[PDB]
mmCIF file of C-alpha atoms in Angstrom:
data_model
loop_
_atom_site.group_PDB
_atom_site.id
_atom_site.type_symbol
_atom_site.label_atom_id
_atom_site.label_comp_id
_atom_site.label_asym_id
_atom_site.label_seq_id
_atom_site.Cartn_x
_atom_site.Cartn_y
_atom_site.Cartn_z
ATOM 1 C CA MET A 23 6.709 7.950 11.803
ATOM 2 C CA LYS A 24 5.448 5.861 8.892
ATOM 3 C CA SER A 25 1.746 5.843 9.800
ATOM 4 C CA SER A 26 -0.982 3.942 7.989
ATOM 5 C CA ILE A 27 -2.281 6.639 5.654
ATOM 6 C CA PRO A 28 -5.850 6.632 4.212
ATOM 7 C CA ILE A 29 -6.437 5.729 0.566
ATOM 8 C CA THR A 30 -7.988 9.146 -0.072
ATOM 9 C CA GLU A 31 -4.451 10.502 0.231
ATOM 10 C CA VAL A 32 -2.319 7.593 -0.964
ATOM 11 C CA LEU A 33 -4.353 6.964 -4.137
ATOM 12 C CA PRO A 34 -3.605 10.343 -5.870
ATOM 13 C CA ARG A 35 -0.107 10.468 -4.337
ATOM 14 C CA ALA A 36 0.692 7.049 -5.805
ATOM 15 C CA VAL A 37 2.531 6.525 -9.086
ATOM 16 C CA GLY A 38 2.047 2.780 -9.200
ATOM 17 C CA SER A 39 -0.554 0.245 -8.147
ATOM 18 C CA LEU A 40 -0.599 -3.539 -7.848
ATOM 19 C CA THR A 41 -3.937 -5.329 -7.838
ATOM 20 C CA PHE A 42 -3.706 -8.630 -5.977
ATOM 21 C CA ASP A 43 -6.352 -11.249 -5.324
ATOM 22 C CA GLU A 44 -7.290 -12.398 -1.819
ATOM 23 C CA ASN A 45 -5.291 -15.535 -2.624
ATOM 24 C CA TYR A 46 -2.375 -13.091 -2.859
ATOM 25 C CA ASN A 47 -2.146 -13.681 -6.595
ATOM 26 C CA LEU A 48 -1.133 -10.760 -8.811
ATOM 27 C CA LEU A 49 -3.983 -9.660 -11.066
ATOM 28 C CA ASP A 50 -3.077 -6.221 -12.413
ATOM 29 C CA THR A 51 0.118 -4.218 -12.554
ATOM 30 C CA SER A 52 -0.088 -0.481 -13.205
ATOM 31 C CA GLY A 53 2.273 2.470 -12.960
ATOM 32 C CA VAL A 54 5.805 2.201 -11.594
ATOM 33 C CA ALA A 55 4.704 -1.079 -10.023
ATOM 34 C CA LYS A 56 5.524 -2.636 -13.398
ATOM 35 C CA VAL A 57 9.269 -2.080 -12.946
ATOM 36 C CA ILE A 58 9.137 -2.751 -9.205
ATOM 37 C CA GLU A 59 9.432 -6.401 -8.121
ATOM 38 C CA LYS A 60 6.596 -8.392 -6.540
ATOM 39 C CA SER A 61 8.759 -10.885 -4.634
ATOM 40 C CA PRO A 62 8.127 -10.125 -0.890
ATOM 41 C CA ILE A 63 4.935 -8.121 -1.324
ATOM 42 C CA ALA A 64 2.440 -11.005 -1.116
ATOM 43 C CA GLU A 65 3.755 -12.037 2.301
ATOM 44 C CA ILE A 66 3.479 -8.469 3.544
ATOM 45 C CA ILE A 67 -0.019 -8.121 2.053
ATOM 46 C CA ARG A 68 -1.365 -10.876 4.305
ATOM 47 C CA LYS A 69 0.528 -9.464 7.283
ATOM 48 C CA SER A 70 -0.871 -6.029 6.516
ATOM 49 C CA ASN A 71 -4.304 -7.605 6.029
ATOM 50 C CA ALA A 72 -4.289 -8.298 9.755
ATOM 51 C CA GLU A 73 -2.616 -4.971 10.566
ATOM 52 C CA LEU A 74 -4.688 -2.480 8.588
ATOM 53 C CA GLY A 75 -8.257 -1.909 7.534
ATOM 54 C CA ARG A 76 -8.913 1.122 5.348
ATOM 55 C CA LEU A 77 -5.425 2.566 5.875
ATOM 56 C CA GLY A 78 -2.311 1.948 3.817
ATOM 57 C CA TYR A 79 0.423 0.081 5.628
ATOM 58 C CA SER A 80 3.819 0.421 3.967
ATOM 59 C CA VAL A 81 4.616 -3.038 2.623
ATOM 60 C CA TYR A 82 7.438 -2.286 0.215
ATOM 61 C CA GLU A 83 9.897 0.470 1.052
ATOM 62 C CA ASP A 84 12.563 1.005 -1.576
ATOM 63 C CA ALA A 85 14.943 3.916 -2.113
ATOM 64 C CA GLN A 86 12.918 4.796 -5.195
ATOM 65 C CA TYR A 87 9.301 4.293 -4.114
ATOM 66 C CA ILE A 88 7.217 3.043 -1.181
ATOM 67 C CA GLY A 89 4.280 0.690 -1.589
ATOM 68 C CA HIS A 90 1.281 0.658 0.740
ATOM 69 C CA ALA A 91 -1.283 -2.144 0.988
ATOM 70 C CA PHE A 92 -4.996 -1.396 1.028
ATOM 71 C CA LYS A 93 -8.055 -3.553 1.581
ATOM 72 C CA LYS A 94 -10.222 -3.017 -1.474
ATOM 73 C CA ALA A 95 -13.584 -4.414 -2.587
ATOM 74 C CA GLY A 96 -12.924 -8.118 -2.197
ATOM 75 C CA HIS A 97 -9.296 -7.622 -3.225
ATOM 76 C CA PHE A 98 -5.919 -6.316 -2.093
ATOM 77 C CA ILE A 99 -4.163 -3.448 -3.841
ATOM 78 C CA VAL A 100 -0.724 -1.996 -3.183
ATOM 79 C CA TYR A 101 -0.318 1.669 -4.047
ATOM 80 C CA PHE A 102 3.273 2.730 -4.677
ATOM 81 C CA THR A 103 4.089 6.324 -3.817
ATOM 82 C CA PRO A 104 7.360 8.086 -4.858
ATOM 83 C CA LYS A 105 8.465 8.427 -1.225
ATOM 84 C CA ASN A 106 5.736 11.035 -0.850
ATOM 85 C CA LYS A 107 6.890 13.186 2.061
ATOM 86 C CA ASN A 108 5.348 16.502 1.034
ATOM 87 C CA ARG A 109 2.164 17.920 2.576
ATOM 88 C CA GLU A 110 1.750 15.490 5.447
ATOM 89 C CA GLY A 111 -0.483 17.726 7.543
ATOM 90 C CA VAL A 112 -3.054 14.959 7.869
ATOM 91 C CA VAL A 113 -3.213 12.380 10.651
ATOM 92 C CA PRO A 114 -4.801 8.933 10.311
ATOM 93 C CA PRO A 115 -6.793 7.764 13.376
ATOM 94 C CA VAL A 116 -5.379 4.629 15.015
ATOM 95 C CA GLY A 117 -8.782 2.990 14.732
ATOM 96 C CA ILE A 118 -11.946 2.676 16.787
ATOM 97 C CA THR A 119 -10.642 -0.551 18.334
ATOM 98 C CA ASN A 120 -12.447 -0.643 21.673
#
């Protein structure tokens, strides 16, 4: 029901974005991600690193916003969406894992 949603959708739908390093160190904080806490996100980023590839796995679900981790160019970025539940007529493929 959550689904790992592609960045092409999550990027524009996001209202906050956290740029982390591969050492799980916070580099940049933008958008609502500034008022959102970073406490448990690093641990979920690594977990999601194994889980996802180019899709956004929800790492931080709050009553206000929901953050999704993405594998970026040599870095990890978490895009926070305002519980975006509108216009979900797009399905993300489970992956070509064969």
